[PDB]
Amino acid sequence: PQALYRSIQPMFKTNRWRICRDDLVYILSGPDKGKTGKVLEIIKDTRTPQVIVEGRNLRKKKVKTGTGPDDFFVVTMEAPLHYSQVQLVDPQTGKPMRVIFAYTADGTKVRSRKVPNPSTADIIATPSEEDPDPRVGLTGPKDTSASLARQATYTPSAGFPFRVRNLERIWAELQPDADXXXXXXXXXXXXXXXXXXXXXXXXXX
Amino acid sequence: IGREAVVDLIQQSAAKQSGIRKGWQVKAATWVKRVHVDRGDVKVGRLEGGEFQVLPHLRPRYFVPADLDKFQLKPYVEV
Amino acid sequence: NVRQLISRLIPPARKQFEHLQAHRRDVVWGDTQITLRVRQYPKSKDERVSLVLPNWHRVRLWSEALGRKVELVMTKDTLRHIEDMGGLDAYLIKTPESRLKSNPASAVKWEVMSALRRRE
Amino acid sequence: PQIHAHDKYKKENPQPANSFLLGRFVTDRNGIIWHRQANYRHARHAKSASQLTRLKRWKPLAPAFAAKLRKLGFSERYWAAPDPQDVPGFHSPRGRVERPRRSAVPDMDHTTGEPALRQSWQPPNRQR
Amino acid sequence: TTYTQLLASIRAAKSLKRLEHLVDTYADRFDAVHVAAAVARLPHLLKYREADLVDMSASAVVLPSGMTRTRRKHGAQLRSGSAEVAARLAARVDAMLPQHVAHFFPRQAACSIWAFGELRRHGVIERMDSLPQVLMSVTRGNLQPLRVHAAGVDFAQLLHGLAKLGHNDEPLLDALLPLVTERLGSMQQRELQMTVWALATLRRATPELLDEVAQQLLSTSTAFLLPSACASVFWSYAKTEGLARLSPRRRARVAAARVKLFDSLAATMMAQALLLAPQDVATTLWACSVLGYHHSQLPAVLGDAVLRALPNCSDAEVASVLESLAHLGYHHAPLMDAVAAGILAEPVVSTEPVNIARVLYAYGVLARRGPRDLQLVGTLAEALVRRLARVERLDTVALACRGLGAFAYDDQAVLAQVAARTEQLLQTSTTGLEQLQAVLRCLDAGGCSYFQLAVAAARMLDDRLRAGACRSAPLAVEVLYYSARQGVXXXXXXXXXXXXXXXXXXXXXXXXXXXXXXXXXXXXXXXXXXXXXXXXXXXXXXXXXXXXXXXXXXXXXXX
RNA sequence: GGGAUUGCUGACUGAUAGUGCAAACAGUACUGUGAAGGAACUAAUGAAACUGGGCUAUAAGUGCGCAUUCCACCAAUACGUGAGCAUUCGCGCAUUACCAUUCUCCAGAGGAUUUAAAUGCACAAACCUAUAUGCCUUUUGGCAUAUGAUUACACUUCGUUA
Ligand SMILES: [Mg+2]
Ligand SMILES: [Mg+2]
Ligand SMILES: [Mg+2]
Ligand SMILES: [Mg+2]
Numbered sequence A: 001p002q003a004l005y006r007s008i009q010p011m012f013k014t015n016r017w018r019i020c021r022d023d024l025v026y027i028l029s030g031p032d033k034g035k036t037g038k039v040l041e042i043i044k045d046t047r048t049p050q051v052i053v054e055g056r057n058l059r060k061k062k063v064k065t066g067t068g069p070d071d072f073f074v075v076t077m078e079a080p081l082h083y084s085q086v087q088l089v090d091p092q093t094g095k096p097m098r099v100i101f102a103y104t105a106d107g108t109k110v111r112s113r114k115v116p117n118p119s120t121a122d123i124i125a126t127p128s129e130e131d132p133d134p135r136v137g138l139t140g141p142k143d144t145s146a147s148l149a150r151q152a153t154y155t156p157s158a159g160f161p162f163r164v165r166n167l168e169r170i171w172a173e174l175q176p177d178a179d180x181x182x183x184x185x186x187x188x189x190x191x192x193x194x195x196x197x198x199x200x201x202x203x204x205x
Numbered sequence B: 001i002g003r004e005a006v007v008d009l010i011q012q013s014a015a016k017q018s019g020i021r022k023g024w025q026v027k028a029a030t031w032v033k034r035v036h037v038d039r040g041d042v043k044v045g046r047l048e049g050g051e052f053q054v055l056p057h058l059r060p061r062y063f064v065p066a067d068l069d070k071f072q073l074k075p076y077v078e079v
Numbered sequence C: 001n002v003r004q005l006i007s008r009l010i011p012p013a014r015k016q017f018e019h020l021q022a023h024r025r026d027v028v029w030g031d032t033q034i035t036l037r038v039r040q041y042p043k044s045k046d047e048r049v050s051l052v053l054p055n056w057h058r059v060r061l062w063s064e065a066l067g068r069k070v071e072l073v074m075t076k077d078t079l080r081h082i083e084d085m086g087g088l089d090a091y092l093i094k095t096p097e098s099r100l101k102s103n104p105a106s107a108v109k110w111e112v113m114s115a116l117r118r119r120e
Numbered sequence D: 001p002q003i004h005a006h007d008k009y010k011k012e013n014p015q016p017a018n019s020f021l022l023g024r025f026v027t028d029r030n031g032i033i034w035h036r037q038a039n040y041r042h043a044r045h046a047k048s049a050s051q052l053t054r055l056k057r058w059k060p061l062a063p064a065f066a067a068k069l070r071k072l073g074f075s076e077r078y079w080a081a082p083d084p085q086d087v088p089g090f091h092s093p094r095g096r097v098e099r100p101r102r103s104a105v106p107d108m109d110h111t112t113g114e115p116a117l118r119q120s121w122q123p124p125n126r127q128r
Numbered sequence E: 001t002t003y004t005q006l007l008a009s010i011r012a013a014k015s016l017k018r019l020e021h022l023v024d025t026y027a028d029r030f031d032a033v034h035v036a037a038a039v040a041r042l043p044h045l046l047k048y049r050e051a052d053l054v055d056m057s058a059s060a061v062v063l064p065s066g067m068t069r070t071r072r073k074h075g076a077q078l079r080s081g082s083a084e085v086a087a088r089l090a091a092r093v094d095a096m097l098p099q100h101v102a103h104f105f106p107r108q109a110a111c112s113i114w115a116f117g118e119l120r121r122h123g124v125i126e127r128m129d130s131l132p133q134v135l136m137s138v139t140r141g142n143l144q145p146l147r148v149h150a151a152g153v154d155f156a157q158l159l160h161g162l163a164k165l166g167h168n169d170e171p172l173l174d175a176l177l178p179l180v181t182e183r184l185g186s187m188q189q190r191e192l193q194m195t196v197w198a199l200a201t202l203r204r205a206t207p208e209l210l211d212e213v214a215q216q217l218l219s220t221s222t223a224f225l226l227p228s229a230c231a232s233v234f235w236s237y238a239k240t241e242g243l244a245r246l247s248p249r250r251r252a253r254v255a256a257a258r259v260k261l262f263d264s265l266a267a268t269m270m271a272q273a274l275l276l277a278p279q280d281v282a283t284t285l286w287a288c289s290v291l292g293y294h295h296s297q298l299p300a301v302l303g304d305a306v307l308r309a310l311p312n313c314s315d316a317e318v319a320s321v322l323e324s325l326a327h328l329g330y331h332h333a334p335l336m337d338a339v340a341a342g343i344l345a346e347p348v349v350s351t352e353p354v355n356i357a358r359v360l361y362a363y364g365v366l367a368r369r370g371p372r373d374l375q376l377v378g379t380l381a382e383a384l385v386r387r388l389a390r391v392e393r394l395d396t397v398a399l400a401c402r403g404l405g406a407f408a409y410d411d412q413a414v415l416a417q418v419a420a421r422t423e424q425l426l427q428t429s430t431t432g433l434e435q436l437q438a439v440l441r442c443l444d445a446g447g448c449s450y451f452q453l454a455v456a457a458a459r460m461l462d463d464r465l466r467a468g469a470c471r472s473a474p475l476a477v478e479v480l481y482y483s484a485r486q487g488v489x490x491x492x493x494x495x496x497x498x499x500x501x502x503x504x505x506x507x508x509x510x511x512x513x514x515x516x517x518x519x520x521x522x523x524x525x526x527x528x529x530x531x532x533x534x535x536x537x538x539x540x541x542x543x544x545x546x547x548x549x550x551x552x553x554x555x556x557x558x559x
Numbered sequence F: 001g002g003g004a005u006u007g008c009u010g011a012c013u014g015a016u017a018g019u020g021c022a023a024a025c026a027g028u029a030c031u032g033u034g035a036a037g038g039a040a041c042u043a044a045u046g047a048a049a050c051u052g053g054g055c056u057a058u059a060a061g062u063g064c065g066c067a068u069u070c071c072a073c074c075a076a077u078a079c080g081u082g083a084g085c086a087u088u089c090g091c092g093c094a095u096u097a098c099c100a101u102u103c104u105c106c107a108g109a110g111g112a113u114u115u116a117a118a119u120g121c122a123c124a125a126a127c128c129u130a131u132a133u134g135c136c137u138u139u140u141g142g143c144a145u146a147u148g149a150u151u152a153c154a155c156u157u158c159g160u161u162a
């Protein structure tokens, strides 16, 4: 292909992909045309989209174990074909075919067979593109459930100007005088209240 | 032409090229070991006879809640 | 040609012109007009533009409207004008607010009008 | 509407007046440039009658000088321009006639006027 | 540095941003007259965005002592930055207002209310009901008996400000009397026209009209006015008396009391040509249409005025002028020719649908039966039927159908969708029945197939009979006749019996009942069948319709 | 005049060119006390100088992505979205496989040439910002008068009911 990448005008202005992943496709051009494969992954790049198929465009990959010289291992790997180099196989004659975005009932858009009668039994089903659910594997420690996280705890009914909500505790009344349920005893222990108390006790004794 | 307008334009120009201190800022970062630059601390007192006196109302107080143990909200929400 | 002759000013005349442009609105400007003296040398290729400097005096006029004297910087010809149309009160009443290109003349004008109105 | 007419980048550089040629030479219908003979303005007492009669005549310019003036663009059909006024029916609305303004003919400086009358251009005198 | 310098720098600001700076930096340095001068200089410093149309090439003297050299374009909007700074400054002024309102006289309050009415006119603030009341108090407490405080100009400016502000005030009932006290003493002609305009748009003062007519007539001429003021005087007398005369417009006539003033106004406006705007002549022609005032060479001059600016006119102004020259029956051949050529050279000829209907009506009821006018009525009909998607009223369709029925418009594919939209809007709240009678007259001007609303028109007319709150005019049997001749239901004879028993109409409508007496259930019950035989209306197809009810009427209808 | 979006704009340039800069961080590295000056560097291909050795001695197809026009839903007044390589001597991208046979000087060093494309250059289009008469103008202002030193006043009227 062209080696510039940024000179290419970005294609796929409306995001619609006729080839999906996990489907039988026909390779149209290249070192192996006439062969077929299953799409492993589609690289959806607007400028240079690629498609990796099952065991067809095989080239040896030199995986470099980090080293200065010739220490490396070699693994055969499916090289990415261009998205334009592949076409879907129809299940009837084994030849490549054009997928169209027909609209069925209920407003949904499906992938039909490019026929003048595009209806049921011509729709090519598209599999979902996401399955990363952390919902399984939840309920670990340091986590909270969605129903607990959606409590309506906040209300503006309280919080009105309450300068005298002190309750008279040495500095636990300072915070609700500056506008507060309970300060920790350790926090009040940090500001020591016993420097004058020891001098008072020693003077008393 | 005013003094504040020039400083504000300098700061707007310095808004660009910001982040993790690249380039000339690597050398300029060493001004803190050359001219006694005061950091972003809050002062807690004043010198009267050369002995510092911390004012007790400016000592740091942290209003920590009563119990953060068995409190029913964790830092993470389940997906 | 005047916009050219302002740009052809010798540095003393140019500094005096900058000072005139700064402190015009500080003094009384009744009939005062700045003037350039461009001298024309007959053996040619020499036109030296300068300034005709105004003369300034600190006269202490007596206001016949309100009972005080005011000190304020003037020229001879505007003093002729003021003392030959009727004095400070008649000048500050009958010269309205725009032929006065001056700040203290405007301030004493408002004080004459306000003191006279309270005097009614 | 990509109509790009470059109004800028047009300087209209000034061309010299060559005003010293106006009253001295004239062009005829054939294209010949004529001039009056010199050596006749004054000192006529020291000259013979035939010499004075000879100097009253006009003579054409030499071909080399005439060629330079013709190439420079000299096309003056009259000694002086005829006034558009003084024609009957074409007169000033308020001027009784007009003021004539007799014109002088000295112009030579190595810095600014008449590039035809100087060999080279002299830079100015320090510009104050 | 002083306060008179601050006043004079407010007065000579020459830009609205300069005035904004003087108001913002000297908030505590103000007094009463500084705020008043700021409000006075607010509406004068607004600027418009490029749609300023020059008048230097139209009037040789550039100003008659006060005008803007570039008036506006109709529909022009302000500059966005100027609108923002003006709205922010007016909010700042409304904030600074009540701290200094107490020392005002009626003059400062009059100028403030007028200028904020101007700001509401331009669209700057549009509300003003933050603090309008303290100004009302300071101009009303010291003018209860027409006291020692100021007068004359302030009444006109206050009432013009309330005209542009509305607000549905209480002191109209108090200020009814000192206004009518002081026309003939201390009001100029422009003050008189502003006051009568303000009384017009408040719809308040009917006895104040004729004394103001006499006062501005006893003034040396009306020629001290300028043409938009004359247009406002025509508009004022239209909106105050023409709707009274028409509702107790081709049948509208004048009364003899105001025609001498109207002739003075027309002579002034024809004298002050080279100064007159399309909106001004639109309101003048509409008011002469409403008042029924038919002067000689006045609509010629106003049509010449709109002919001189026709590339610069919006289509609303042209449609208004053509309606006002259609209702008031007048032909202006250069204007009609220029308008026809202009919107026949226009390739995509769409505008607002009411403007299409107005031009259709204007070419309908005027003698324009040339080939160009036929091409124009076809083009406007197609461009309208492309956009019958309005739920407003059937009134636009009523004007369109009157224009299409004045012509013999026979293009069927237009009339099909016209009928479809008519029956689609007819099930909603149609206001009148003549607005459907115009559609029926259009659809029977040419051939049509429109049963699907003929039954609905029968349902509406039987609904109007069951309501018992309608005219039962000869136009009721005119509504009956079209649906009767196309439809055949048999329940429609009740109206044609009951309204004809209380007839109040002699000829050309009992013939409609006799010709409709075959499709309905009424067999033969007509004393007027011989009176129409003695009348011979000869409009309907009564010769073929009297062949089953009265054989003598079959000969009487055609011979 | 100036500041930003768009250009089915360019017989403008194509990496020593075009802005000083097409680049991870160019007004950068670096130079100078300072004001200030101010670089080089795209992706492949790999010319010459240079230095060692040897020798001599078929102007086509096929796929994708859009744009134009048809259609049917449209805000219904400029198109708003959507099936369709349905349509166009459209545009951009992708792709096209030969099989010997030794009489070709070789190896390095170097970065020219060739190919590719504006985020560079010049403008253009809307958008925003910035008194009248006559004299001299010269991409625009200097000079007398007049609604005039004054807190005041005309105008964008939507009309339609035979
Ligand atoms: Mg370069
Ligand atoms: Mg290079
Ligand atoms: Mg360069
Ligand atoms: Mg390279």
Ligand SMILES: [Mg+2]
Residues within 6 Å of the ligand: none
């Ligand atoms: Mg080589």
